[PDB]
Subunit: 154 residues, 6 copies
């Protein structure tokens, strides 16, 4: 199947700036389905598991400080090629390089000790599966119809 699930984290900078709704709307308007979502305040150990691949990189600690600064909204988006699509929608890692039209391109720019970039998006299907399991239990993910689902029945 082409339908995939990916993890998105609306980071502290977006939450603090009141951009939760605007970000979610971009995904809904694209046709992506929110199958799981919740506001949580990530603890350092959970944050380090999420970013375990960067544990030896210079920006690691600053990244942990940043992602755990305030509560965030973690959500699982489902849809055709969702992983690559959401990555495209997010834009370049550093918002200053992100193209206008992308989430980081339109909303991000300023940085702290960390490169604040509005949201996190799984980089691959493998990472998505791992990340989703880190933040969500199966009972927190749902299968339900969005309004236009019937239109695409093959």
């Amino acid at each position: 199947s082409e339908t995939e699930r990916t993890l998105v984290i609306i980071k502290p900078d977006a939450v603090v700036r009141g951009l939760i709704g605007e970000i979610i709307s971009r995904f809904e308007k694209k046709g992506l389905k929110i199958v799981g979502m919740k506001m949580i305040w990530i603890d350092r150990e959970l944050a380090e598991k999420h970013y375990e691949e960067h544990r030896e990189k210079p920006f690691f600690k600053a990244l942990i400080d940043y992602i755990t600064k305030t509560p965030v909204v973690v959500m699982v988006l489902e849809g055709r090629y969702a992983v690559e699509v959401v990555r495209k929608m997010a834009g370049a890692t550093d918002p200053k390089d992100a193209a206008p039209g992308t989430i980081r391109g339109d909303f991000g720019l300023e940085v702290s000790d960390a490169i604040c970039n509005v949201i996190h998006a799984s980089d691959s299907k493998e990472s998505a599966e791992r990340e989703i399991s880190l933040f969500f239990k199966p009972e927190e993910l749902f299968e339900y119809p969005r309004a236009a689902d019937w239109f695409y029945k093959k």
Copy 2:
């Protein structure tokens, strides 16, 4: 303190229509703070507890069918006189009577066996406290700063 918390449920009709983000944005833009939020699928037992006061009213069964139709997003909003303010933003119970500019006035109209009206908003501080405790555990509610909080320091 004038600051209070109220419960909002983004109902199945809003979730199915992809209006989660637009609704959240209206609250964020107003200055209200999201201190708790999660997508859940309410079962009949939980639904009947939430609407226990209407247990004997005619529209009860249809109301339970409606609120449990698909997952919903339950969220807690915090702010100055949040309870009455959110009710004002919501608009008339039946969307056809809701004024343009309100959530129900701009997004609602069509009904099923139930009067589908986009969101639920606690009708009082007493109801808010009861409803918040019904859907959220204390650890799921947070105290953190929104960008402009410092501006209002009294």
Copy 3:
């Protein structure tokens, strides 16, 4: 049935100002269905038939000049109590008196010899039936499903 059809004319001032899309979106977002629509350039004869009830009123000539100034978009909206709902969304006849949130309240203000007010909305089911028949042939009106129609199945 509570479902009805009403006629809306996006007037010359709205067409010239590039507000066709924004007006249509307000109706779509409300849940109303566009069952007919076309851009036409009304001539004096057709205009006088549409406004036949004002044939003797003072503002008649200026009203005809206004509605025939440039092409307009005539459209038929279908929905629960569509006639009164659309009138409510339109706002006060003179835009200066229209409430913020309404179409006239948000988009209208300036006037010519005529009280330019962005759109026309049938004032009753009787007027709607007459107006729809004046601008549309039966084959130009359609019955089809909007995405969320299934949700409201009674």
Copy 4:
């Protein structure tokens, strides 16, 4: 002259999802002029004439089923280099590959047996002339001033 006319079809997926207004607004905001527009329900024979160049391609029938699934809105846009400009605004054929900011990039993703992609846009001046004639009679196209036309007088 650099002024051209191109044909746009707001496809069934966009109509069903209630995106007619949002799409039209993008063209109006760009400065393009709507010189013709109407909601019609395309018949199979007309659809096959429109897509005659793909009659021998594997996806042909699915394309006909898709474009005739529900009514659509056909419109003619006029403006400087309108053909190439509207094509750029539409984005990649498959919405998953379309850049954020484009119509397909922001609104499309899910597919049926056909690659549902929100709108159709003439691919060349030659195709535009042919397509416009297929859906519109000369009496349905208009020459009138948009608000800012005077500003660009050379």
Copy 5:
């Protein structure tokens, strides 16, 4: 003439929250013309002159502290019955009482020692003339055409 000019001050809370553009857009969309505008940082002397009528009221000191907290944007709007129209668009003095759809109703809520309410709007033609002369020199106010001005030629 029904045309008049009124003074609007986009207050510190709106500037700090990044709402300058959204506020200006509401006036532009209504059809009002910006004939003067500038970002300035009001000192106590200028602030007290502007609010001279409240010199003896209880909230005076806090009001001066508020309006001089950060730079503001002062602007002059011109249009049909602009004074009362802008007051209508602004909404109730205390944002919690302001109706959804109005500027204060959609953007304001939280308060400091002062009733932060997003913008200031002249309360009468007499006040407008005084306020405009206080903040602007004649050479900073312009007479020019907005795109659709020609449409309203009487």
Copy 6:
């Protein structure tokens, strides 16, 4: 420091079309800070100083006629790598070539004797310093906190 200041001119075509607010909002939403702004009607000599680098180019006079056609809004934006960022946000010089998502890509297209392109953005730090000094005195530029500034403290 990475923080820079750049000059933006909302050109006559944007002012006439009522796009001042929408343009400003894009900068505010990106996180850029407006440290100076005012509506002025540029005189030919000032315009020629601003565009002194093009004095010998064929389109020079038409450019002067265009930039001095009606009042404009000049503003100084401050932020991380502001010069290159604002240039990216503006898009290609000729709006027809500008990517959807950029200011010129979304709002520009039509041209007069001059290539009307909505806004001007300094092309380099050197040009920015020179251009800012041409339109602003030091007393017209301010240092103040935007809501989220504290979040990025390093």
